[PDB]
């Protein structure tokens, strides 16, 4: 109804851009990882007397960043207000202050609420690190010293690329060069019609939804980008050479190896299909306020 | 002030590696495209590489393709341009840019230039 | 895309300068303006055929309908000897392009 329900679509990464929290649960590509790693001490009975303690471990850095994401509701629907209202003509008509000062207050809020989903999720961030490391000394009660059969590593291999089949990445891909062919040259014939004579308030509603669709273009292009990386480096595993036997120390990294794509992929997919809507509901938005312009030519 | 400062052109033997810099300030670095773009002592200008904001479209001339590739370092406001196997007719002193815009993918203007690093080829 | 522009233009001080950029149907798309000094830095000057960049003359208008798009330079100075580009994003190959450069120089 020409209105925004749903701004999933916003993220924030930390200053050095090594953690990406996302809305979406589980917020973090880093739990993937650690819910792919029970999977893995799944077949070591060394390491797999350990997993009731590690979900432990895990669902509680999962209930905390579930828990932070939820304090940033407030800042979240303080945000959606005024999109609703930048988006929309009528309800900015129904207020009485310059549309100028709206969007003062939409870029306050905006990164507020971003700023939001960061801070109170830094004590979260800390904790990747320290799990990350508890899952190396784990994976140090190996029986193996230094003949590691490979075949628990490249059997995960075998099961990504099923995993990875599932996702329509040639689909996802003309999707994004279509919908992004569609939104430049909206934003260019706005710059060609652009003039003003008469009210903006239906131009200016274009721009500012068209200013979200290249927002979730970009942030759609990163994971299609990150998420064919994730499939390229393990297949390109799978059609590399398998050594029958490798030490422990490199078995560490092997399973960080896939597991870090693994999940980068599994992360990707919750964002992309999000991604995939709110361009989709963006689209819709915009030619709509484009068929409200276009409707009252004999003005 | 948004500021562009670019660096690393110098002399190189023909197909040989050069890494170029562009240094950004002044701005939210981050949403906008960035894009180098080179010209040759006496010709015009001519585009080279555009790239999104967060990296996940990277464009590329015909001239450049496979040797050329762009990147960005969105924590440190940096802007790269590694090149390989350079020719003689690649000799030119090369800008970088930035739409006047966010989110445009280099369908925008280009606002803000650097003063340009020269790469020179030659035996 | 090709764009052609006339390599030299020359002007007298006082007069009206008139850089010129053709394309197919150019005024189906932005043109973007640019101006050069000798050993300087390009600096946009005109933006979607007839916008100004804030602390530009207004002297520097713009005008761009079917086939030519037009950049317009009035009561010229010394000061505006250089080189213009006009710049337009190809359609089906999905880049930047710019033009061969017009040369303006002041006479008289």
């Known amino acids: 109804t020409n209105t925004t329900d749903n701004i999933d679509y916003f993220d924030i990464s930390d200053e050095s851009n090594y953690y990406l929290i996302s809305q979406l649960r589980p917020h973090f590509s880093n739990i993937y990882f650690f819910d792919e790693f029970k999977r893995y001490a799944s077949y070591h009975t060394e390491i797999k007397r350990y997993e009731d303690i590690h979900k432990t471990k895990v669902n509680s850095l999962l209930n905390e960043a579930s828990r932070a994401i939820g304090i940033c509701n407030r800042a979240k629907n303080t945000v959606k207000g005024l999109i609703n209202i930048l988006e929309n003509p009528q309800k900015f008509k129904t207020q009485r202050e310059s549309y100028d000062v709206k969007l003062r207050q939409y870029e306050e809020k905006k990164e507020a609420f971003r700023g939001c989903l960061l801070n109170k999720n830094r004590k979260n961030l800390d904790q990747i690190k320290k799990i990350n490391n508890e899952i190396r000394d784990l994976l140090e009660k190996l029986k193996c010293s230094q003949d590691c059969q490979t075949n628990v590593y490249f059997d995960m291999i075998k099961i990504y690329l099923v995993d990875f089949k599932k996702m329509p990445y040639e689909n996802y891909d003309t999707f994004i060069k279509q919908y992004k062919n569609s939104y430049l040259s909206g934003v260019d014939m706005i710059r060609k019609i652009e003039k003003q004579i008469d009210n903006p308030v239906t131009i200016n509603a274009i721009k500012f939804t068209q200013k979200e669709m290249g927002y979730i273009i970009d942030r759609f292009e990163y994971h299609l980008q990150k998420v064919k990386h994730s499939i390229d480096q393990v297949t390109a595993l799978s059609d590399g050479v398998k050594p029958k036997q490798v030490t422990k120390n490199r078995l560490k990294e092997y399973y960080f190896n896939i597991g870090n794509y693994y999940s980068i992929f599994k992360f990707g997919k919750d964002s992309l299909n999000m991604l995939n809507k709110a361009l989709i509901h963006k689209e819709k938005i915009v030619h709509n306020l484009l068929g409200e312009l276009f409707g009252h030519l004999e003005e | 002030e948004v500021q562009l400062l670019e660096s690393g052109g110098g002399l190189v033997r023909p197909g040989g590696s050069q890494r170029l810099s562009c240094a950004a300030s002044?701005?939210?670095?981050?949403?906008?495209?960035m894009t180098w773009v080179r010209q040759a002592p006496g010709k015009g200008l001519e585009w080279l590489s555009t790239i999104s904001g967060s990296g996940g479209s990277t464009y590329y001339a015909d001239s450049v393709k496979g040797r050329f590739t762009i990147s960005r370092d969105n924590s440190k406001n940096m802007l790269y341009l590694q090149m390989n196997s350079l020719t003689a007719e690649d000799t030119a002193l090369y800008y970088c840019t930035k739409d006047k815009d966010e989110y445009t993918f280099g369908h925008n203007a280009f606002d803000v230039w650097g003063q340009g690093t020269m790469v020179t080829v030659s035996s | 895309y090709e764009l052609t522009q006339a390599p030299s233009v020359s002007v007298a001080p006082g007069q009206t300068a008139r850089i010129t950029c053709g394309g197919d149907?150019?005024?189906?798309?932005?043109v973007n303006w640019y101006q050069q000094k000798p050993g300087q830095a390009p600096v946009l000057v005109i933006y979607?055929?007839?916008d100004r960049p804030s602390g530009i003359p207004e002297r520097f208008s713009g005008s761009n309908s079917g086939n030519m798009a037009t950049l317009s330079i009035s009561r010229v100075e010394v000061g505006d000897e250089a080189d213009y580009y006009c710049?337009?994003?190809?359609?089906?190959?999905?880049?930047?392009?710019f033009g061969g450069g017009t040369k303006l120089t002041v006479v008289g």
């Open positions: 149907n150019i005024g189906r798309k932005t």
């Open positions: 002044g701005f939210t670095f981050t949403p906008y495209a």
């Open positions: 710049q337009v994003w190809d359609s089906n190959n999905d880049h930047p392009v």
């Open positions: 979607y055929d007839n």
